[PDB]
Amino acid sequence: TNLKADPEELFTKLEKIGKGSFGEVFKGIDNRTQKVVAIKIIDLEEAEDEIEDIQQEITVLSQCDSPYVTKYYGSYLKDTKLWIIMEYLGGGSALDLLEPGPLDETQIATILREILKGLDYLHSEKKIHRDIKAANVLLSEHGEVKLADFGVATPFWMAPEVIKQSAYDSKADIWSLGITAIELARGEPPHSELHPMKVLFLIPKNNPPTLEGNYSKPLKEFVEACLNKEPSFRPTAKELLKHKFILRNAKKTSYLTELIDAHHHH
Numbered sequence: 273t274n275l276k277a278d279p280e281e282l283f284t285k286l287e288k289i290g291k292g293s294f295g296e297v298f299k300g301i302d303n304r305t306q307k308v309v310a311i312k313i314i315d316l317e318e319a320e321d322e323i324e325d326i327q328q329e330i331t332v333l334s335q336c337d338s339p340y341v342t343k344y345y346g347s348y349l350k351d352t353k354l355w356i357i358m359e360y361l362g363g364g365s366a367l368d369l370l371e372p373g374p375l376d377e378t379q380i381a382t383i384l385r386e387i388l389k390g391l392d393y394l395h396s397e398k399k400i401h402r403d404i405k406a407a408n409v410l411l412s413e414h415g416e417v418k419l420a421d422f423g424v425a426t427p428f429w430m431a432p433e434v435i436k437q438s439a440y441d442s443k444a445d446i447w448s449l450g451i452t453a454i455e456l457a458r459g460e461p462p463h464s465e466l467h468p469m470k471v472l473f474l475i476p477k478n479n480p481p482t483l484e485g486n487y488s489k490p491l492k493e494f495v496e497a498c499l500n501k502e503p504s505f506r507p508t509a510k511e512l513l514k515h516k517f518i519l520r521n522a523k524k525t526s527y528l529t530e531l532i533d534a535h536h537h538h
């Protein structure tokens with residue numbers, strides 16, 4: 273992480289694009305290349321207790337090089353502010369693309385396939401995302417789908433073994449994938465109406481959520497395969513990329529540009 277070069281000279285900061293983990297995030301220009309970047313600025317004096325978490329997500333992002341994980345460009349320290357620079361993705365999150373209306377099973381299967389690819393990359397490298405959800409899946413202007421905002425080493429997306437603070441593995445990402453499939457179909461995860469502390473004991477207590485609604489059988493089975501209480505019974509991502517729901521419904525990522533265009537008129 274660079275400490276000598278001034279990030280205020282190296283980047284043109286523009287408008288906020290969201291308050292994320294610990295700090296505000298900005299669209300910004302890279303003065304060296306005029307490429308657009310995302311710039312997270314975290315005040316470190318104003319958030320000391322979590323610095324190790326910031327440090328952890330920075331290191332694990334730096335070890336990835338995949339078309340499915342958002343690129344990490346480095347970090348800077350000016351006075352007490354840490355600047356975190358990432359590739360900028362102009363289509364928004366999958367969550368933003370849910371506002372216009374409801375997704376068809378083509379767009380759902382397509383987003384899920386690309387998530388499965390990044391999940392497959394991360395797990396092959398013995399890495400765990402730990403915070404899979406529609407708000408952490410970002411799309412480029414051209415509909416490429418990438419993962420962002422890795423989770424620390426709201427509970428609605430948590431696998432039960434994760435809540436029962438029992439050390440876990442990659443199969444926790446498959447559970448969260450399942451919840452994200454529901455989120456993609458219905459707009460919001462199971463139990464979303466309820467107080468988080470109620471959810472904290474419902475997830476280990478209750479039977480797994482199922483996808484209710486007029487949705488295709490292969491998609492419902494997809495959710496059911498992901499949402500098994502016992503982790504070792506969930507499919508791998510590699511296995512899920514061969515799942516009938518994906519194979520019949522998932523088209524080329526380019527087709528998602530229509531979905532982004534709707535959200536930019538709206």
Ligand SMILES: CNc1ncc2cc(-c3ccc(-c4cccc(C)n4)cc3Cl)c(=O)n(CCCCN)c2n1
Nearest residue numbers: 292293297310311312329330358360361364407408
């Ligand atoms: C709208 N497009 C877009 N394109 C790219 C980005 C990149 C980031 C980003 C994510 C994590 C870290 C990060 C890395 C290490 C440690 C920590 C604490 N944080 C930094 C950044 Cl710069 C971002 O927040 N947003 C906003 C939407 C976030 C939705 N969850 C983006 N939005």
